[PDB]
């Protein structure tokens, strides 16, 4: 039961050296790209975010870009996507991407993509290739040595206050404090050239890393033997549940629209519903994991999974995931839950 | 006469080491399960209650589970079955077995059973197997070494006042005192996932049944010295044994298979209420005391009425539970055995 989950966690720990070595490779590439990018006038002042691992051998890196004070205009009533313009009119090196007053996502995403392709080639160090993951992605993906993939995402940084669609987001007040929510909302936010064109959408993955690492009601959660909670183990288990299922439905790829981010997002909502560290005692691993699985289910059947930061933005909208894929994954997860997770067997 | 019953008690003493070893096996198994269960979030706080030996090779164990303050709602007008809900609306790990406000018996019984099934298999200690006894049973039954069976019953514990259906039950005042009944009624009561409707639980008072059996005299020192040896325990043994011997003689059509030692125990407690003095149970008067027990059991069969000692409006001999034929059949055999100095105790 709970002893089964621990066996899965032990199993996952085995490929910890294998995912570190892959990461060593990813770092070298990133740093190299980071230097050439600074030689471009538009991209000097580029840097690495978080000051990484979605799945085994799938890596995620963000390139922050310090940008002059930004005027945001909300596209349609999509609560996440925005037109970008400047609030100065002496002109700056991003003017080659302006169209009117609007900063072109796609034009900047196109040169960003171009510079990387340029650096890929003269590299005789290794075999790296460009590939496009899916339309829409603000990420440029690389394949390192035909086994490791890296999502490299361009990100504009805005130090001004978070937009109004985030007002009721980040409901961490009863879990982490109200004052932590204030401290976090003083931090920058990011805009990535994901269109849904000339649109950018909000990204808060730096806060995501932060609430994951600093995750307890107690400031000393997981800093001593008396406060070992199972939040991280539960997210590990959720991600792994999804990946196993995605592989078992490899024939017709019914589940290929779901990702670790849906899982991570739902896990954050569960932390909000269960704000006490006593609710994540490692002795209750089986039950805590069950709490995460039941909430993910309710999300699938209700077809509603709200962005943690942007509550009116539903990640499970029919516009993103078809109604059939959701009903299908509900059936699967329901079954696995009703039978003590056969996908975690042997 | 009285010597024939004594011979039977002596014969039964011969298999005292044989059932003690079997009980030793049962304990080891139960204690093993008790630890694995405490690793589960919903079942930590589980323990052993204390009734142990229903039959010569049938064992009965209860697993108590401390539960926060319990709201009961009586199902239909059944005086024994109840819905279980919490008076909390912070919630405890039984929250995964909820449906609305109601605590599901079947949902909790199914994880209990499922946890047990898991420990049984990887056990290389012996051949232990799962079996379901009968429809309705709140028990998970095990078979040890293909000879010994153990009823393991989950039981919620409530430290609140006994429900109203019990108000006229436990009529022990003239036998054990009015003050003993007050003491016992301050003790917890239990709910077992015996369903009527798979979300119901019914009441259990077997801990109280043990207490009045062991502590059974009007005199506090009954059976603590040579001057006070009563035959209460002996009469219940003979009664159980009578039922078991008969159930074996009708091995053919299984005519008596609705009856169990619990009816006999239930009926013996009524006879105690009727004979409250230790002098009505002198060991010299064994044949006569034993007759009192058999006539009353007959009257119950013939009147088709055997009320639960704790819940008087709950009739165990109702046509709803045992058919009218089976009762009339057992009345015949018992009438015959009583009329002929109990031939089933011969040789
Ligand atoms: N590496 C990377 N960083 C991103 O920010 C991101 N956003 C999208 N994608 C990938 O682009 C494609 C377009 O999907 P879309 O945007 O419509 O919905 C996305 C997106 O709205 C949301 N999502 C993913 N990452 C983030 C994120 N960091 N912040 C907010 N939302 C996100 O959850 C959906 C599923 O994402 P993925 O299935 O894991 O991959 C997507 C997809 O392949 C991303 N890939
Ligand atoms: N180990 C165990 N503990 C129980 O509480 C219990 N309750 C029922 N059963 C078994 O489930 C089945 C359903 O019988 P039912 O409920 O209709 O009538 C039962 C029930 O009304 C009552 N009875 C037996 N044990 C108890 C008990 N501990 N408390 C109250 N009543 C009981 O007398 C009848 C005959 O019981 P059994 O024929 O020996 O075993 C029963 C039966 O196999 C039990 N088995
Ligand atoms: Zn912690
Ligand atoms: Zn006595």
PDB file of N, CA, C and O in Angstrom, chain A residues 34-66:
ATOM      1  N   UNK A  34      24.476  31.050 -23.766  1.00  0.00           N
ATOM      2  CA  UNK A  34      24.327  32.265 -22.976  1.00  0.00           C
ATOM      3  C   UNK A  34      25.378  33.305 -23.342  1.00  0.00           C
ATOM      4  O   UNK A  34      25.090  34.491 -23.340  1.00  0.00           O
ATOM      5  N   UNK A  35      26.589  32.859 -23.667  1.00  0.00           N
ATOM      6  CA  UNK A  35      27.648  33.776 -24.082  1.00  0.00           C
ATOM      7  C   UNK A  35      27.455  34.371 -25.484  1.00  0.00           C
ATOM      8  O   UNK A  35      27.565  35.581 -25.654  1.00  0.00           O
ATOM      9  N   UNK A  36      27.166  33.526 -26.476  1.00  0.00           N
ATOM     10  CA  UNK A  36      26.923  34.003 -27.839  1.00  0.00           C
ATOM     11  C   UNK A  36      25.720  34.942 -27.882  1.00  0.00           C
ATOM     12  O   UNK A  36      25.739  35.952 -28.579  1.00  0.00           O
ATOM     13  N   UNK A  37      24.674  34.614 -27.136  1.00  0.00           N
ATOM     14  CA  UNK A  37      23.516  35.481 -27.094  1.00  0.00           C
ATOM     15  C   UNK A  37      23.857  36.880 -26.580  1.00  0.00           C
ATOM     16  O   UNK A  37      23.217  37.857 -26.982  1.00  0.00           O
ATOM     17  N   UNK A  38      24.845  36.993 -25.696  1.00  0.00           N
ATOM     18  CA  UNK A  38      25.170  38.313 -25.151  1.00  0.00           C
ATOM     19  C   UNK A  38      25.911  39.166 -26.175  1.00  0.00           C
ATOM     20  O   UNK A  38      25.983  40.385 -26.035  1.00  0.00           O
ATOM     21  N   UNK A  39      26.414  38.534 -27.231  1.00  0.00           N
ATOM     22  CA  UNK A  39      27.085  39.268 -28.296  1.00  0.00           C
ATOM     23  C   UNK A  39      26.097  39.964 -29.230  1.00  0.00           C
ATOM     24  O   UNK A  39      26.452  40.883 -29.963  1.00  0.00           O
ATOM     25  N   UNK A  40      24.848  39.525 -29.206  1.00  0.00           N
ATOM     26  CA  UNK A  40      23.804  40.198 -29.959  1.00  0.00           C
ATOM     27  C   UNK A  40      23.313  41.405 -29.165  1.00  0.00           C
ATOM     28  O   UNK A  40      23.132  41.312 -27.950  1.00  0.00           O
ATOM     29  N   UNK A  41      23.102  42.530 -29.851  1.00  0.00           N
ATOM     30  CA  UNK A  41      22.671  43.782 -29.214  1.00  0.00           C
ATOM     31  C   UNK A  41      21.306  43.675 -28.533  1.00  0.00           C
ATOM     32  O   UNK A  41      21.067  44.275 -27.483  1.00  0.00           O
ATOM     33  N   UNK A  42      20.403  42.927 -29.146  1.00  0.00           N
ATOM     34  CA  UNK A  42      19.071  42.791 -28.587  1.00  0.00           C
ATOM     35  C   UNK A  42      19.084  41.895 -27.340  1.00  0.00           C
ATOM     36  O   UNK A  42      18.252  42.055 -26.448  1.00  0.00           O
ATOM     37  N   UNK A  43      20.037  40.968 -27.278  1.00  0.00           N
ATOM     38  CA  UNK A  43      20.058  39.968 -26.217  1.00  0.00           C
ATOM     39  C   UNK A  43      21.226  40.086 -25.250  1.00  0.00           C
ATOM     40  O   UNK A  43      21.582  39.115 -24.602  1.00  0.00           O
ATOM     41  N   UNK A  44      21.867  41.235 -25.164  1.00  0.00           N
ATOM     42  CA  UNK A  44      22.847  41.365 -24.097  1.00  0.00           C
ATOM     43  C   UNK A  44      22.093  41.816 -22.863  1.00  0.00           C
ATOM     44  O   UNK A  44      21.179  42.632 -22.940  1.00  0.00           O
ATOM     45  N   UNK A  45      22.414  41.236 -21.727  1.00  0.00           N
ATOM     46  CA  UNK A  45      21.579  41.461 -20.567  1.00  0.00           C
ATOM     47  C   UNK A  45      20.649  40.276 -20.415  1.00  0.00           C
ATOM     48  O   UNK A  45      19.779  40.241 -19.541  1.00  0.00           O
ATOM     49  N   UNK A  46      20.824  39.304 -21.300  1.00  0.00           N
ATOM     50  CA  UNK A  46      20.134  38.042 -21.160  1.00  0.00           C
ATOM     51  C   UNK A  46      20.801  37.332 -19.987  1.00  0.00           C
ATOM     52  O   UNK A  46      21.955  37.605 -19.675  1.00  0.00           O
ATOM     53  N   UNK A  47      20.051  36.479 -19.297  1.00  0.00           N
ATOM     54  CA  UNK A  47      20.599  35.691 -18.212  1.00  0.00           C
ATOM     55  C   UNK A  47      19.806  34.426 -17.946  1.00  0.00           C
ATOM     56  O   UNK A  47      18.761  34.190 -18.568  1.00  0.00           O
ATOM     57  N   UNK A  48      20.307  33.621 -17.012  1.00  0.00           N
ATOM     58  CA  UNK A  48      19.641  32.400 -16.561  1.00  0.00           C
ATOM     59  C   UNK A  48      18.654  32.668 -15.435  1.00  0.00           C
ATOM     60  O   UNK A  48      18.984  33.372 -14.491  1.00  0.00           O
ATOM     61  N   UNK A  49      17.442  32.127 -15.553  1.00  0.00           N
ATOM     62  CA  UNK A  49      16.430  32.186 -14.490  1.00  0.00           C
ATOM     63  C   UNK A  49      16.610  31.058 -13.459  1.00  0.00           C
ATOM     64  O   UNK A  49      17.361  30.115 -13.701  1.00  0.00           O
ATOM     65  N   UNK A  50      15.912  31.179 -12.323  1.00  0.00           N
ATOM     66  CA  UNK A  50      16.020  30.287 -11.151  1.00  0.00           C
ATOM     67  C   UNK A  50      17.361  30.431 -10.421  1.00  0.00           C
ATOM     68  O   UNK A  50      17.617  29.721  -9.443  1.00  0.00           O
ATOM     69  N   UNK A  51      18.176  31.383 -10.883  1.00  0.00           N
ATOM     70  CA  UNK A  51      19.548  31.608 -10.412  1.00  0.00           C
ATOM     71  C   UNK A  51      20.423  30.377 -10.650  1.00  0.00           C
ATOM     72  O   UNK A  51      20.513  29.484  -9.805  1.00  0.00           O
ATOM     73  N   UNK A  52      13.949  22.761 -13.842  1.00  0.00           N
ATOM     74  CA  UNK A  52      15.017  22.100 -14.595  1.00  0.00           C
ATOM     75  C   UNK A  52      14.619  20.729 -15.153  1.00  0.00           C
ATOM     76  O   UNK A  52      14.810  20.482 -16.340  1.00  0.00           O
ATOM     77  N   UNK A  53      14.031  19.861 -14.328  1.00  0.00           N
ATOM     78  CA  UNK A  53      13.717  18.488 -14.760  1.00  0.00           C
ATOM     79  C   UNK A  53      12.215  18.155 -14.751  1.00  0.00           C
ATOM     80  O   UNK A  53      11.664  17.803 -13.706  1.00  0.00           O
ATOM     81  N   UNK A  54      11.556  18.255 -15.907  1.00  0.00           N
ATOM     82  CA  UNK A  54      10.132  17.927 -16.006  1.00  0.00           C
ATOM     83  C   UNK A  54       9.919  16.422 -15.889  1.00  0.00           C
ATOM     84  O   UNK A  54       9.004  15.956 -15.207  1.00  0.00           O
ATOM     85  N   UNK A  55      10.762  15.684 -16.604  1.00  0.00           N
ATOM     86  CA  UNK A  55      10.744  14.222 -16.668  1.00  0.00           C
ATOM     87  C   UNK A  55      12.191  13.709 -16.776  1.00  0.00           C
ATOM     88  O   UNK A  55      13.109  14.509 -16.967  1.00  0.00           O
ATOM     89  N   UNK A  56      12.418  12.391 -16.594  1.00  0.00           N
ATOM     90  CA  UNK A  56      13.771  11.884 -16.882  1.00  0.00           C
ATOM     91  C   UNK A  56      14.249  12.254 -18.303  1.00  0.00           C
ATOM     92  O   UNK A  56      13.571  11.947 -19.291  1.00  0.00           O
ATOM     93  N   UNK A  57      15.400  12.924 -18.380  1.00  0.00           N
ATOM     94  CA  UNK A  57      16.021  13.365 -19.642  1.00  0.00           C
ATOM     95  C   UNK A  57      15.211  14.394 -20.446  1.00  0.00           C
ATOM     96  O   UNK A  57      15.433  14.574 -21.643  1.00  0.00           O
ATOM     97  N   UNK A  58      14.279  15.072 -19.783  1.00  0.00           N
ATOM     98  CA  UNK A  58      13.611  16.220 -20.375  1.00  0.00           C
ATOM     99  C   UNK A  58      13.962  17.402 -19.505  1.00  0.00           C
ATOM    100  O   UNK A  58      13.602  17.421 -18.336  1.00  0.00           O
ATOM    101  N   UNK A  59      14.633  18.400 -20.067  1.00  0.00           N
ATOM    102  CA  UNK A  59      15.112  19.530 -19.270  1.00  0.00           C
ATOM    103  C   UNK A  59      14.508  20.870 -19.634  1.00  0.00           C
ATOM    104  O   UNK A  59      14.188  21.128 -20.792  1.00  0.00           O
ATOM    105  N   UNK A  60      14.368  21.737 -18.641  1.00  0.00           N
ATOM    106  CA  UNK A  60      13.724  23.011 -18.894  1.00  0.00           C
ATOM    107  C   UNK A  60      14.515  24.203 -18.349  1.00  0.00           C
ATOM    108  O   UNK A  60      14.715  24.337 -17.139  1.00  0.00           O
ATOM    109  N   UNK A  61      14.961  25.060 -19.268  1.00  0.00           N
ATOM    110  CA  UNK A  61      15.757  26.241 -18.939  1.00  0.00           C
ATOM    111  C   UNK A  61      15.120  27.540 -19.456  1.00  0.00           C
ATOM    112  O   UNK A  61      14.623  27.589 -20.577  1.00  0.00           O
ATOM    113  N   UNK A  62      15.146  28.587 -18.642  1.00  0.00           N
ATOM    114  CA  UNK A  62      14.635  29.895 -19.046  1.00  0.00           C
ATOM    115  C   UNK A  62      15.676  31.013 -19.122  1.00  0.00           C
ATOM    116  O   UNK A  62      16.507  31.190 -18.237  1.00  0.00           O
ATOM    117  N   UNK A  63      15.597  31.780 -20.199  1.00  0.00           N
ATOM    118  CA  UNK A  63      16.486  32.910 -20.395  1.00  0.00           C
ATOM    119  C   UNK A  63      15.760  34.216 -20.126  1.00  0.00           C
ATOM    120  O   UNK A  63      14.913  34.644 -20.901  1.00  0.00           O
ATOM    121  N   UNK A  64      16.064  34.808 -18.982  1.00  0.00           N
ATOM    122  CA  UNK A  64      15.474  36.076 -18.600  1.00  0.00           C
ATOM    123  C   UNK A  64      16.098  37.171 -19.441  1.00  0.00           C
ATOM    124  O   UNK A  64      17.229  37.049 -19.914  1.00  0.00           O
ATOM    125  N   UNK A  65      15.341  38.233 -19.653  1.00  0.00           N
ATOM    126  CA  UNK A  65      15.840  39.362 -20.412  1.00  0.00           C
ATOM    127  C   UNK A  65      15.368  40.643 -19.754  1.00  0.00           C
ATOM    128  O   UNK A  65      14.166  40.895 -19.647  1.00  0.00           O
ATOM    129  N   UNK A  66      16.323  41.420 -19.252  1.00  0.00           N
ATOM    130  CA  UNK A  66      15.997  42.681 -18.615  1.00  0.00           C
ATOM    131  C   UNK A  66      15.473  43.639 -19.678  1.00  0.00           C
ATOM    132  O   UNK A  66      16.173  43.947 -20.637  1.00  0.00           O
TER     133      UNK A  66
END
